[PDB]
Write a protein that binds this ligand. Structure first.
Ligand SMILES: Cc1cn([C@H]2C[C@H](O)[C@@H](COP(=O)(O)OP(=O)(O)O[C@H]3O[C@@H](C)[C@H](O)[C@@H](O)[C@H]3O)O2)c(=O)[nH]c1=O
Ligand SMILES: Cc1cn([C@H]2C[C@H](O)[C@@H](COP(=O)(O)OP(=O)(O)O[C@H]3O[C@@H](C)[C@H](O)[C@@H](O)[C@H]3O)O2)c(=O)[nH]c1=O
Ligand SMILES: [Cl-]
Ligand SMILES: [Mg+2]
Ligand SMILES: [Mg+2]
Ligand SMILES: [Mg+2]
Lengths: 601, 599
């Protein structure tokens, strides 16, 4: 009885990525006799198929099959699905990895709620978020929210196999199309799939590694295809209007902003006319009535054919952002506290302004463009209460991103001079690092802090920064922690000495080093460090006689102790016979200090 | 004819291309060549520098070339060239520098009219936003009345009355370990009563930037301070040199220098600095200093290196970057409104803190208790802020203060008892103020701002975040203020970088083609037109459709009148029919408007 079948379409697969894929399957906590691997090679011209069979030699649950080159992964995915026999199917691409507890957590969640689709938290290499809104909390009855529950609509979810077969849900083979996973997930929801969102554990790592669509005529052929599919197949009004709104905003209106400043005039004219024709033919007017002000402006000028005004608006909007600065950062008890501030600016320089005229707060525009727009489309008066300001964290090893919960933030619209108003935010939050340590590997990792600011239609998710020097250490319940300004001026948090030495960053009270030569113990107290709870981290140290340049290191035991709000390194000389002056270098958790410690024995 | 100027150049393995540029800068001098002489002394070059100098000497009757045995530096060849010179004034020109075209005439006339022993002419350096910001601000033919400060910066690149140097036996030190020999040279000129003039309105000398032992360094520093104390007689002059050099070279290692050096060199130089302060620097000197330097003086004498290192980490990154709040052309000038604020690395605000009626430097308690209360109390310094604009010619490297600005600096309660420092400024650029040589008419100009307060000095390029491109045609000057690729404010005049047609845009539907005269008129879209302007150019035509177009060059013309600008293109002997590509080329800059016209 197989719980999970992993479908992997391969073609000229990079072997190192394939090794990492197979490794992440083997590390699954689930019993290997409870899942199967179904590999279908899509006519790889390299030696991937022979390597795939080689992997299957020592794995009885792995099936490999060769097919004539299909061109994409839709054909091999369908073939593997028909020959799969597991209760749930994960479509895993040949260059991605799975987290070690995914199979168990996803299946238990799925079986307990009789789900047809488990949308588990997906992780990407780049960016400060992925599925920020959808992966916010676990939802076993996610389909009640509508078709939005399946976003982001990647195929890297777990689908009940019997549900796919029963409604004949397959990938578009013999049809090269764009966003085939949008089609796939839409058909699943159209057929009434019971959807569950598993948000408290990263399940899939979609890795960035580095042709179809590039061409503007092919791209807008696929876009007309996607929108017609929405209009022809989605029968729920709420679901149809969400998909129309979401894809009109992101892919159609999405070229009428900064995209205009990064393309040549030939491509702009070609894609602008496609967008105007698609808006008129497929997008009802009520769709834009529920868009933000700046998108309503873009939709109005698009349907007027006013590309020149859109190009001008893009120059005006170029650079609007919200960067956060650290106002204060310190450890308290078992947590790290932050106070941050931000304000809307151009490129983190001069303030971004809105302007008050009579009883309206208006976007600042030249008179030439305001006279072409409906009065309400540049009146922000009703949107001044919709700002959000939140902190987030990202593990530099795992690439997993999380919102930091419990934050307190406020955003004010402030009159700076005359009738000009700026937008200022202040926030305070704390990090409890255990909230984000889910696999053992997470305990030794650098973490990078960011902030997410939204308002007036703009989204700015950027790394937290600070100007002044910042290095602060903590020893909290056996966790070495170092918050610091990194080389890019951004805020990082080393936990477990993955990048920095806590002894080096804390300093040493060299005049307070104690040598008990009868007990053979050298006590090295740490200078500046926040100590909470009891800690004992075992490590080692190295002694070298001063002067003897090429002397062998004398390896000895050492342990970083946190006790009664103070920290120290105890070095144990053991059975070594020592006389004279020695260089002492501590090695806690793989990081050596640079404190130039010398002791006389 | 009397020799007005002797140019003293000590050469040693001179870089050939710079030697050519040096020769050219002297040949281009507006002074008649029979009124100056070139006195070159080669310090035993291992390259063929002496051979090249003689190839110059063949075609130059006023050029003297001599080779001595290597002395290790330019001091001895300078002194030898000085005692064999015949001119009234001597300039010490290094073998890798150049002189501006009108320097000899302006300097000599200024020195001869005012009977000056030393003419300190405005010097220009490759890097930085100022040089001699204070001293080179105004012309002063009686500058020695202000004291020995009138000769700062004390480079040797001034003009000295030859007989004055010879009468007082003023020479450069040529010893085994020579450092700051120009400081001694200039100081000696002042001690012997030199009449000094500052020529500030014309760049005279380009000091070009081209491609360590702590024990020796502090030996030289002790030598320099002892020279000050033993030879300077006027107390005002002695106090100035002691203050200036104590601040810059002794206390000057007690800030950010501590973060750029290893602990061994720090301990050597700190102990040297502490001995020098104790032995040579009287206590009243530091009473003349700003609060932060009084902290440094106090902790130095206390031997408290650890507090100084911690203060350096607290101070690191303090700056004041200016943002453009408004920029526009009005009449014949370009106007700016800017804002600034003291920050750490243009991020979070720099703060001071109010306790009782004191405005205190924010410091850890451990340091505050080790310091006299007055030294971290900014209360009496909160109106000592300066905030002014400057400009730099990117080709000449010359920097100037922009005059006429209005500014205001405020100490603002941000929250609680924390106060930030905010400035605002209005100024305008009259580009005529800075065009002195013909080359200056076609040049990119870079704008900067100078902020000082609480001990800090921040002179940084003006910046803007939003896209800024504005063009103007003002009395035959094409002017484009723009956010350059580094995000800083630049002013291109004469089309040295950008095309004013491309940045102004063209009203494609107002193009007027006239077959009778063959005059294609292309009006410009957005541009500030003031006065009348007429600039010659040319255009290129290509049949739209033909692969290798084999272009047709025709004469074009950019014109401005009645607050309007247009480009008139003349095809003359026309041989054209159908759609034809047209791109203009004004002042070597061609637009990218993709103009198509069908004739
Ligand atoms: C080119 C090609 C790929 N494939 C397989 C390899 C992978 O497992 C899978 C996807 O290719 P990758 O390089 O991993 O893609 P990718 O890393 O860019 O990932 C994404 O690409 C988007 C375009 C898809 O819509 C998404 O579903 C997702 O797969 O297709 C074949 O089977 N045959 C082929 O001929
Ligand atoms: C090395 C050497 C140089 N010289 C000459 C070459 C130059 O004309 C002159 C100055 O050297 P430059 O390479 O131009 O250095 P430089 O470009 O660093 O110039 C400066 O150097 C500082 C140390 C001085 O204090 C300054 O007054 C200034 O001269 O010395 C000799 O005559 N003999 C030598 O052995
Ligand atoms: Cl530039
Ligand atoms: Mg992939
Ligand atoms: Mg030089
Ligand atoms: Mg800033």
């Amino acid at each position: 009885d197989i719980k999970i079948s992993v479908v992997v379409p391969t073609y000229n697969t990079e072997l190192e990525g394939l090794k990492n894929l197979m490794a992440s399957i083997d590390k699954q906590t689930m019993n290997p006799d409870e899942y199967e691997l179904v590999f279908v090679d899509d006519g790889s011209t390299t030696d991937t198929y022979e390597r795939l069979q080689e992997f299957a030699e020592t794995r009885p649950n792995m099936t490999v099959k060769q097919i004539e080159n299909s061109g994409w992964g839709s054909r091999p995915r369908n073939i593997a699905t028909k020959m799969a026999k597991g209760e749930y199917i994960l479509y895993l691409d040949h260059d991605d990895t799975v987290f070690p507890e995914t199979f168990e957590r996803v299946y238990n969640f799925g079986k307990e709620n009789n789900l047809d689709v488990v949308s588990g938290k997906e992780v990407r290499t780049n960016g400060w978020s992925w599925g920020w809104k959808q992966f916010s909390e676990n939802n076993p009855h996610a389909e009640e929210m509508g078709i939005e529950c399946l976003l982001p609509m990647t195929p890297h979810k777990f689908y009940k196999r019997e549900f796919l077969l029963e409604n004949d849900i397959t990938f578009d083979d013999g049809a090269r199309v764009l966003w085939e996973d949008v089609y796939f997930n839409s058909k699943a929801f159209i057929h009434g799939a019971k959807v569950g969102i598993l948000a408290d554990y990263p399940t899939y790592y979609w890795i960035a590694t580095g042709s179809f669509g590039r061409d503007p005529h092919e791209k807008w052929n696929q876009i007309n295809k996607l929108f017609n599919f929405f209009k022809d197949n989605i029968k729920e009004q709420r679901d149809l209007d969400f998909m129309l709104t979401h894809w009109y905003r992101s892919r159609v209106l999405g070229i009428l902003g900064q995209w205009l400043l990064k393309n040549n005039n030939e491509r702009i004219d070609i894609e602008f006319n496609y967008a105007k024709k698609l808006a008129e033919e497929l997008i009802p007017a009520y769709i834009s009535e529920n868009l933000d002000k700046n998108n309503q402006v873009k939709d109005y000028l698009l349907r007027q054919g006013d590309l020149d005004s859109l190009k001008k608006l893009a120059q005006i909007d170029a650079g609007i952002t919200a960067l956060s600065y650290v106002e204060d950062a310190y450890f308290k008890e078992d947590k790290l506290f932050f106070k941050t501030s931000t304000k809307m600016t151009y490129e983190d320089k001069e303030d971004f302004f809105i302007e008050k005229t009579a009883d309206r707060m208006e976007r600042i525009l030249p008179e030439e463009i305001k006279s072409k727009l409906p009065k309400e489309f540049f009146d922000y008066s009703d949107d001044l209460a919709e700002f959000t300001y939140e902190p987030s964290i990202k593990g530099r090893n795992s690439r997993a991103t999380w919102k930091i919960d419990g934050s307190t933030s406020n955003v004010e619209v402030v009159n700076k001079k005359a009738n000009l108003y700026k937008i200022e935010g202040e926030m305070s939050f704390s990090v409890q690092i255990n909230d984000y340590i889910l696999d053992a590997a997470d305990k030794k990792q650098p973490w990078d802090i960011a902030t997410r600011f939204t308002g007036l239609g703009y989204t700015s998710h950027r790394a937290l920064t600070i100007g002044k020097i910042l290095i602060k250490t903590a020893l909290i319940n056996n966790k070495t922690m170092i918050v610091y300004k990194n080389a890019s001026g951004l805020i990082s948090l080393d936990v477990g000495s993955s990048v920095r030495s806590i002894v080096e960053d804390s300093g040493v009270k060299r005049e307070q080093i104690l040598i008990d030569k009868t007990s053979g113990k050298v006590t090295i107290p740490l200078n500046e460090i926040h100590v909470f709870g009891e800690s004992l981290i075992e490590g080692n140290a190295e002694l070298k006689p001063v002067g003897i340049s090429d002397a062998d290191p004398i390896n000895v035991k050492a342990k970083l102790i946190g006790e009664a709000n103070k920290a120290r390194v105890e070095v144990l000389l053991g059975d070594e016979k020592l006389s004279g002056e020695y260089h002492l270098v501590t090695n806690i958790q793989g990081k050596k200090d640079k404190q130039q410690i010398k002791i006389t024995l």
